[PDB]
Amino acid sequence: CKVPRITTHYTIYPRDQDKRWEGVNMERFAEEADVVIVGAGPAGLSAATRLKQLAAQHEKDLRVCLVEKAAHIGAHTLSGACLDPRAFEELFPDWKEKGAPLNTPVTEDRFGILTEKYRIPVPILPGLPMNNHGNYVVRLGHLVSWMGEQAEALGVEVYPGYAAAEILFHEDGSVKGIATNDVGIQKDGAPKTTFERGLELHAKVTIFAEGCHGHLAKQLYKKFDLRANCEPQTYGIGLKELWVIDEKKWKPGRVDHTVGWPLDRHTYGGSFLYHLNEGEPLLALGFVVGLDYQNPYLSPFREFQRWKHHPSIKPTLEGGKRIAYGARALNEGGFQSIPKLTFPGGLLIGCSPGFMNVPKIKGTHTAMKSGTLAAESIFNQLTSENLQSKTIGLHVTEYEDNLKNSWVWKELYSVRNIRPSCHGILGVYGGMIYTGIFYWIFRGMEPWTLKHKGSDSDQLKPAKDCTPIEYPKPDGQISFDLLSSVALSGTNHEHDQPAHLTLKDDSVPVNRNLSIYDGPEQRFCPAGVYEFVPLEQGDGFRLQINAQNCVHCKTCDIKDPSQNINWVVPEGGGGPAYNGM
Numbered sequence: 001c002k003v004p005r006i007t008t009h010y011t012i013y014p015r016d017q018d019k020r021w022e023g024v025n026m027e028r029f030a031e032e033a034d035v036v037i038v039g040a041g042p043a044g045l046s047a048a049t050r051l052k053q054l055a056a057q058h059e060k061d062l063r064v065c066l067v068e069k070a071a072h073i074g075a076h077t078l079s080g081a082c083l084d085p086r087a088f089e090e091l092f093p094d095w096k097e098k099g100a101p102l103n104t105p106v107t108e109d110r111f112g113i114l115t116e117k118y119r120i121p122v123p124i125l126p127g128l129p130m131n132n133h134g135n136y137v138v139r140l141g142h143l144v145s146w147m148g149e150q151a152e153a154l155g156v157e158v159y160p161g162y163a164a165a166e167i168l169f170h171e172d173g174s175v176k177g178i179a180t181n182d183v184g185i186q187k188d189g190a191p192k193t194t195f196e197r198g199l200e201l202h203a204k205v206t207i208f209a210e211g212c213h214g215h216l217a218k219q220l221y222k223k224f225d226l227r228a229n230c231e232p233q234t235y236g237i238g239l240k241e242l243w244v245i246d247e248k249k250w251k252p253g254r255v256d257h258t259v260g261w262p263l264d265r266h267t268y269g270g271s272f273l274y275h276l277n278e279g280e281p282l283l284a285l286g287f288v289v290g291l292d293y294q295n296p297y298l299s300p301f302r303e304f305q306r307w308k309h310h311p312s313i314k315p316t317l318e319g320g321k322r323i324a325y326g327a328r329a330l331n332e333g334g335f336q337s338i339p340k341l342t343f344p345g346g347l348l349i350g351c352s353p354g355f356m357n358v359p360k361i362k363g364t365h366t367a368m369k370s371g372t373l374a375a376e377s378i379f380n381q382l383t384s385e386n387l388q389s390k391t392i393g394l395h396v397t398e399y400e401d402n403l404k405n406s407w408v409w410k411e412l413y414s415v416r417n418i419r420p421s422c423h424g425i426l427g428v429y430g431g432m433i434y435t436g437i438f439y440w441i442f443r444g445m446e447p448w449t450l451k452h453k454g455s456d457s458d459q460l461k462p463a464k465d466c467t468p469i470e471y472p473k474p475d476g477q478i479s480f481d482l483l484s485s486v487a488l489s490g491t492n493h494e495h496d497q498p499a500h501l502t503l504k505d506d507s508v509p510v511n512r513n514l515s516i517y518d519g520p521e522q523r524f525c526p527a528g529v530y531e532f533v534p535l536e537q538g539d540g541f542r543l544q545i546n547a548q549n550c551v552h553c554k555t556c557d558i559k560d561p562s563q564n565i566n567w568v569v570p571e572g573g574g575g576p577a578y579n580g581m
């Protein structure tokens, strides 16, 4: 054996095309519902909840099935989480006595610009977007878990551990529904004696709420040419760890943000540090880096680990304990990047299509509202005659009409130029200047909309033209390595299954990436999944994919300069085991 056909997933090598599957029956059982929702995130749960609420108010029968990758609800949820209650209280005006975990109202907002040695404080006025008056600091994972609890109580059929692995289409071309992941296929693609076909969930309308860079939505965009009038989405990667600190340095209700060191002015990114007020002297902290970065040598993980040593931060975690680690990609393309959210047989909500306010670093409240609106609109179409056809699947276009008229649209429109304004000669500092003028003073009224520089994927420079970055060795107390970090994510998968990190051509990572960019996949992956192993015969490397370490952040599918990777779901239940992240 060899070079190793790293790729054996059925999505690249159809088993309808390989002899090893000759005798196997691929017949799947099917279940019928009115609405099928993919992803138990704040958006999917908002949609599900509201739909079962609308059903109760008007006494109608509605079968709503919600499927999620996570072993249990909230396990793949990663956010820093400063919450704008606006849409949440709309869905649950009753939350306080019903027990929702919004125990930390923001009491102090701080922002600073860092240099290697110091911190420059920045005045936070009520007029800027980094103002958190009226908001809560929360462990999104727990709020999500709480939501799944209310959803079930309302009659929603929640299915954690089930990954939507395949979109179903009616012959007229509209979406019929989805099928869950099959199970029991070995690493090489061969069927096991335990092979088991997935479940088919049919509905009049399927809601897609996979979050930032959903793998089914990525293909949905293609199928219905949904990006026709929009700039492609732009992203950033968010790394995060939970810490237990010295009571003496615990300032409950405090929200910190910083820009500057260790990033150069042309690399977008920053930190967040929030003091939780849920009983323990706990801190949710993390780092963000725009995947539009240019240096192939940059490592967002090392930037984050190195960031903690800055003198304004290290003392705070000194004597502290790091108890969890996770990473997720987020949207930063904002308004200019919103695709068409509707098509025959389905809808897109939440960060999958992307409603993130990047300067506020908030996308949960808007993801919730989109779920609330999509629900109201769908129930609305299920409750009439006014029959639209030839698409057995409904085209709930009214959803986009109403979203365009909600506060969500104007909020995203108003901060649309902040992220793109960071592409000037002053980089992120130019963006700050632009924010003081056109937002703080003109609230984004300027008669124009700036554009992004294109896809994050073609923003990389060749390694020979750049200078490697010298990162410090972790000290095991404030900074750690990747392996220990992966352990604190509790992520895991059945080892004997084909890699879900699929390659379209098994030779480009060694022939192009390593050759031209020096294998950026070994540094942009926050989990150490891709590694180049020294070749046995003579001279080079081979790429090895350690699919079991994947935290499902979706970065590699976003940043690969050769766009040769396609992330798909592994067997349901695999991945992070985040608790209140």
Ligand SMILES: Cc1cc2nc3c(=O)[nH]c(=O)nc-3n(C[C@H](O)[C@H](O)[C@H](O)COP(=O)(O)OP(=O)(O)OC[C@H]3O[C@@H](n4cnc5c(N)ncnc54)[C@H](O)[C@@H]3O)c2cc1C
Binding pocket: 038, 039, 040, 041, 042, 043, 044, 067, 068, 069, 070, 076, 077, 078, 079, 080, 081, 082, 083, 084, 140, 162, 163, 164, 165, 209, 210, 211, 212, 214, 215, 216, 237, 238, 239, 240, 286, 287, 327, 328, 329, 330, 349, 350, 351, 352, 356, 361, 362, 363, 364, 365, 367, 569
């Ligand atoms: C580091 C970081 C910090 C952040 N800080 C804030 C903040 O302070 N405030 C704020 O409002 N927002 C913040 N956000 C953003 C916030 O987390 C998101 O906007 C929000 O979670 C988006 O929600 P969602 O409901 O679309 O999906 P997500 O929370 O992304 O969840 C999508 C769900 O879908 C599941 N899924 C995906 N594909 C499939 C499939 N095919 N089959 C089954 N299940 C599937 C996933 O497992 C996941 O649970 C932050 C994000 C990051 C990464």
Ligand SMILES: COC1=C(OC)C(=O)C(C/C=C(\C)CC/C=C(\C)CC/C=C(\C)CC/C=C(\C)CCC=C(C)C)=C(C)C1=O
Binding pocket: 122, 128, 130, 257, 258, 259, 267, 268, 269, 270, 271, 272, 288, 289, 359, 361, 418, 419, 422, 428, 431, 432, 433, 435, 436, 437, 440, 441
């Ligand atoms: C952790 O996440 C992150 C942030 O959030 C904490 C960020 O910010 C940034 C970077 C910068 C951006 C997005 C531009 C945003 C604007 C800010 C932060 C406003 C702060 C300061 C201003 C506006 C200074 C005042 C302006 C002056 C004096 C100009 C002169 C004339 C007048 C207007 C009177 C990044 C990369 C980030 O990752």
Ligand SMILES: CCCCCCO[C@@H]1O[C@H](CO)[C@@H](O)[C@H](O)[C@H]1O
Binding pocket: 125, 126, 127, 128, 441
């Ligand atoms: C041109 C500058 C004029 C004076 C601004 C006065 O008062 C302003 O109140 C708002 C709150 O509404 C804050 O956001 C501003 O930072 C503060 O300066």
Ligand SMILES: CCCCCCO[C@@H]1O[C@H](CO)[C@@H](O)[C@H](O)[C@H]1O
Binding pocket: 420, 421, 422, 423, 424, 430, 434, 450
């Ligand atoms: C600063 C980062 C991106 C924004 C591009 C804006 O530059 C333009 O400059 C001229 C001055 O020459 C102004 O009169 C215009 O109103 C402004 O849009």
Ligand code: SF4
Binding pocket: 501, 524, 525, 526, 527, 528, 529, 530, 549, 550, 551, 552, 553, 554, 555, 556, 557, 567
């Ligand atoms: S393989 Fe991809 S999706 Fe998994 S953690 Fe690494 S970059 Fe994220």
Ligand code: NA
Binding pocket: 229, 230, 231, 336, 338
């Ligand atoms: Na557009």
